């Protein structure tokens, strides 16, 4: 069985693929733009992916990878009544480029299903886009669309660390995503069946995408403090307890 | 840093401490009694712990272990309208013996706080005991009492696998417990601050406790299909993504 | 696949089976007796095993475990021209008791093959017993006999740390043992085919055995500073890179 | 602490940086050219490195990474009396290009110390270059020169798998390299102190380099069957047991 894993407790440019406004500052992955004084700027889009492609499924053998990722993020809004747009963990084709900003989170073009995007994302959505969104802040699973196939309520705590765990089990095709705000003692969970052989190419880049608002005042930070990933592809035909010790 | 981990995809008597009705049958940990025909029996109590003690905190250094556990369980009731009582993952003192059966799950004596029990448990409670329980099936965190310090709703699916992840972070003192029913695509999550140095002895046995009803007809299986554990104790002063690959 | 591992950077009585003179002092596993002033005593025998049994092979499936262990030891002799006897890493039957002291290292009765001992050991032999030993200090593989089936020269550095790696590959039946003296930049290696299904019971205790001389003046310490173990048993049919990081 | 690891039981172009003749064929990394009939060709040079750079030391904190790698290789010569030249595991600067072929193994220019190459390599040298080589087949440690700073005898078994383990301990600055031929039950070991902060840049590519002879008839395969790597960089201040299970 082929294995790949990593743990970034601090970040570095050298092992990341940085796109647009995404930047490493003082060991922190700052996906969207912040001023020298620490003011988040509007109209920002940023992306970061790991420098090594991950084989998510094998066409010749029919094997599917089981994988898990954990990260700690922090969305900090100067004014909570007006922030946007959110951040997401995504699997994209290898040389994949950013798409629409704002509510599309740098990952999608529109609300309708476009299979040629070949993108799976778990979004953490700070802004009510209504054109497609549920009423409150939510975690969603995005398959080739910004219009999540399933969501769950997220009691987002402004400027407070969120510790995320996303797991994919090959044998049940189940994608699970959970968020914890340790300072609030709150927790949230989403689970949906996703067939990755239907959605993603055999090889993907894993990482993050985030945006700020399309208006001057709708601003927030989209920072990632730590990140851990592990994947296991069987040859023919994920120890999770040991994995979250690495990251969250 | 001292480390300990294991993964049981199948079970064996030889590395377990079996108490009361708990038994290994065909590689499955059957905590409570089942007939030769496969009929769950009432009035049953069973416990299983790992044969090696886990240091959960160090008095001399002040260090606290971070740990994670994942398991898959299956509660199967012939009649869903009348089952009891549930199963729990517990940390108990090393030579610890079973307590009250039924709604006390083999772990506690009463509803009031008794610190000398020194027991932390995450319960999966199939039965409304009301004397202390919420109205529906629930996951709860038990600290020296059967009366959980916090609960969350559990849409229990009869005879369907439940994949559980329990994590404890030393730095935030946060115990998180999540349950997934992959066949239903449902998921549930509980999080509460627990100071283990206040609750548990330095050394504990980790494992499971379960009971059937205190009436002839209130019967269910309490089976554990797989189990994974990992713990990390720093010397002075948990990679989770890699851990759940091991178990769930 | 069933997994078991641990890493002791410091030692504790609570997760060990201590036999005879073996003792934990200031986080160090002291296999043989030392005075309050730090003087090693003669005629000493000591043993330490992990509290959880390891399944080394499965009779019903025919599967054999692959395993690896790493430890750092220190043999300190007041007078190098007169020390004895050495220390060994051993796999013994579960409730196994010490045997002959001195040159037999607490593991064997005699030089002739006795299959009922069911013991595999990698010895680090400080003393020329001649009755069976090579001329100089040696690493040997012991199968049911103190008379090694294969040895290699060991340029033992008195009172200097030795970092050991022992690996067993199920698919090649190859036991490899290596010793490094980092302060000397020296290294030594032994490899021999051993069929464990022929030698060991299905379940074993893993750990250490050591002895001091059978004369007043032939004295040394037999200390173990750190210890790491991992084993993997397939269900029906070892990552050494990551192992020795955690390991050594 | 930042972590990185992988295990290739089979190979893929997508996560490798392939240079010159190096190619992936049927899941095997074939470093040097082979004909369609399976005939090794002369005058070949090939290199393969992992697509993610490894931080081997940190200038700002003074921290040095501990790392380990394990691989299985196979050198197959049609005529043993005339093969060349060998293969090596190397750490090179990130965008580093191949150097001289033949006896220089694609890694070096000459025998004299050139610090600007910034290359550490463990060589497995099939050919007596005399200009710098010991008389028989050898494992050597190469620091900025093809003239090894230390070697050891290698009883090379033609067309037989060699299982290699290379470890670097930050605290002792010790590089250890061992080779096992499981079919022969033979083993070999080399150890030397290397200060990596003196030799390598902070970031390196890890991987392999190999060459065939500079004469028509001096031909061999230089195949790598599996490969595992793990590295650990502390923030301010390696479990080998578990590593070599996943590893080898
Ligand atoms: O005002 C901020 C908002 O502006 C909308 O036009 C946009 O679609 C939203 O995603 C959000 O950015
Ligand atoms: O009838 C079944 C029930 O009986 C009650 O007396 C008991 O307290 C419950 O835990 C449950 O077992
Ligand atoms: O005096 C030292 C020696 O004494 C021998 O009789 C004994 O067999 C050796 O193992 C060694 O201990
Ligand atoms: O002919 C075989 C040999 O030829 C030499 O000139 C060369 O330096 C050696 O590396 C080897 O390839
Ligand atoms: Ca939105
Ligand atoms: Ca109850
Ligand atoms: Ca001897
Ligand atoms: Ca040469
Ligand atoms: Mn949304
Ligand atoms: Mn309850
Ligand atoms: Mn001997
Ligand atoms: Mn050479």
GROMACS .gro file of C-alpha atoms in nm, chain C residues 3-7 9 66-70 150 163 165-169 172 174 176-193 228-232 238-248, chain D residues 3-7 9 66-70 150 163 165-169 172 174 176-193 228-232 238-248:
model
  108
  499UNK     CA    1  -0.122  -0.350   1.496
  500UNK     CA    2   0.064  -0.291   1.822
  501UNK     CA    3   0.335  -0.039   1.907
  502UNK     CA    4   0.491   0.161   2.189
  503UNK     CA    5   0.777   0.399   2.264
  505UNK     CA    6   1.170   0.729   2.613
  562UNK     CA    7   0.644  -0.865   1.084
  563UNK     CA    8   0.800  -0.677   1.376
  564UNK     CA    9   1.071  -0.431   1.469
  565UNK     CA   10   1.227  -0.310   1.791
  566UNK     CA   11   1.475  -0.038   1.874
  646UNK     CA   12   2.517  -1.712   1.406
  659UNK     CA   13   2.158   0.203   1.972
  661UNK     CA   14   1.763  -0.210   1.574
  662UNK     CA   15   1.613  -0.557   1.540
  663UNK     CA   16   1.370  -0.632   1.256
  664UNK     CA   17   1.188  -0.947   1.149
  665UNK     CA   18   1.041  -0.974   0.799
  668UNK     CA   19   1.172  -1.351   0.390
  670UNK     CA   20   1.488  -1.280   0.801
  672UNK     CA   21   1.831  -0.861   1.121
  673UNK     CA   22   2.006  -0.705   1.419
  674UNK     CA   23   2.226  -0.397   1.414
  675UNK     CA   24   2.416  -0.204   1.680
  676UNK     CA   25   2.554   0.146   1.657
  677UNK     CA   26   2.790   0.322   1.900
  678UNK     CA   27   2.726   0.686   1.797
  679UNK     CA   28   3.009   0.825   2.014
  680UNK     CA   29   3.254   0.592   1.833
  681UNK     CA   30   3.089   0.612   1.487
  682UNK     CA   31   3.096   0.232   1.482
  683UNK     CA   32   2.829  -0.007   1.354
  684UNK     CA   33   2.771  -0.383   1.344
  685UNK     CA   34   2.514  -0.608   1.177
  686UNK     CA   35   2.386  -0.970   1.192
  687UNK     CA   36   2.128  -1.146   0.974
  688UNK     CA   37   1.992  -1.501   0.978
  689UNK     CA   38   1.682  -1.685   0.859
  724UNK     CA   39   1.041   0.108   2.103
  725UNK     CA   40   0.843  -0.183   1.954
  726UNK     CA   41   0.602  -0.228   1.664
  727UNK     CA   42   0.434  -0.536   1.516
  728UNK     CA   43   0.194  -0.603   1.231
  734UNK     CA   44   0.705  -0.282   0.814
  735UNK     CA   45   0.756   0.089   0.741
  736UNK     CA   46   1.110   0.121   0.878
  737UNK     CA   47   1.157   0.481   0.767
  738UNK     CA   48   0.890   0.619   1.001
  739UNK     CA   49   0.948   0.353   1.268
  740UNK     CA   50   1.301   0.447   1.371
  741UNK     CA   51   1.216   0.816   1.400
  742UNK     CA   52   0.957   0.741   1.666
  743UNK     CA   53   1.177   0.450   1.764
  744UNK     CA   54   1.526   0.593   1.795
  747UNK     CA   55   0.665   1.599   0.963
  748UNK     CA   56   0.686   1.450   0.614
  749UNK     CA   57   0.669   1.088   0.501
  750UNK     CA   58   0.575   0.861   0.212
  751UNK     CA   59   0.579   0.497   0.105
  753UNK     CA   60   0.537   0.014  -0.283
  810UNK     CA   61   1.624   1.364   1.183
  811UNK     CA   62   1.537   1.146   0.884
  812UNK     CA   63   1.522   0.789   0.762
  813UNK     CA   64   1.479   0.618   0.427
  814UNK     CA   65   1.432   0.260   0.322
  894UNK     CA   66   3.423   0.616   0.453
  907UNK     CA   67   1.693  -0.392   0.119
  909UNK     CA   68   1.803   0.145   0.549
  910UNK     CA   69   1.961   0.489   0.582
  911UNK     CA   70   1.906   0.693   0.899
  912UNK     CA   71   2.033   1.032   1.012
  913UNK     CA   72   2.019   1.129   1.380
  916UNK     CA   73   2.455   1.259   1.726
  918UNK     CA   74   2.538   1.015   1.271
  920UNK     CA   75   2.403   0.506   0.927
  921UNK     CA   76   2.352   0.296   0.615
  922UNK     CA   77   2.276  -0.075   0.605
  923UNK     CA   78   2.213  -0.322   0.324
  924UNK     CA   79   2.056  -0.665   0.350
  925UNK     CA   80   2.040  -0.936   0.082
  926UNK     CA   81   1.754  -1.148   0.224
  927UNK     CA   82   1.801  -1.431  -0.029
  928UNK     CA   83   2.166  -1.462   0.083
  929UNK     CA   84   2.106  -1.385   0.454
  930UNK     CA   85   2.387  -1.129   0.428
  931UNK     CA   86   2.406  -0.783   0.583
  932UNK     CA   87   2.642  -0.484   0.573
  933UNK     CA   88   2.664  -0.157   0.767
  934UNK     CA   89   2.839   0.185   0.746
  935UNK     CA   90   2.835   0.474   0.993
  936UNK     CA   91   3.000   0.816   0.986
  937UNK     CA   92   2.949   1.157   1.145
  972UNK     CA   93   0.995   0.493   0.190
  973UNK     CA   94   1.101   0.823   0.349
  974UNK     CA   95   1.028   1.005   0.675
  975UNK     CA   96   1.167   1.325   0.825
  976UNK     CA   97   1.108   1.522   1.144
  982UNK     CA   98   1.292   0.899   1.483
  983UNK     CA   99   1.072   0.602   1.575
  984UNK     CA  100   1.259   0.335   1.378
  985UNK     CA  101   1.050   0.045   1.507
  986UNK     CA  102   0.729   0.163   1.339
  987UNK     CA  103   0.911   0.324   1.045
  988UNK     CA  104   1.058   0.012   0.886
  989UNK     CA  105   0.729  -0.176   0.903
  990UNK     CA  106   0.562   0.084   0.684
  991UNK     CA  107   0.901   0.132   0.524
  992UNK     CA  108   1.024  -0.216   0.441
   0.00000   0.00000   0.00000
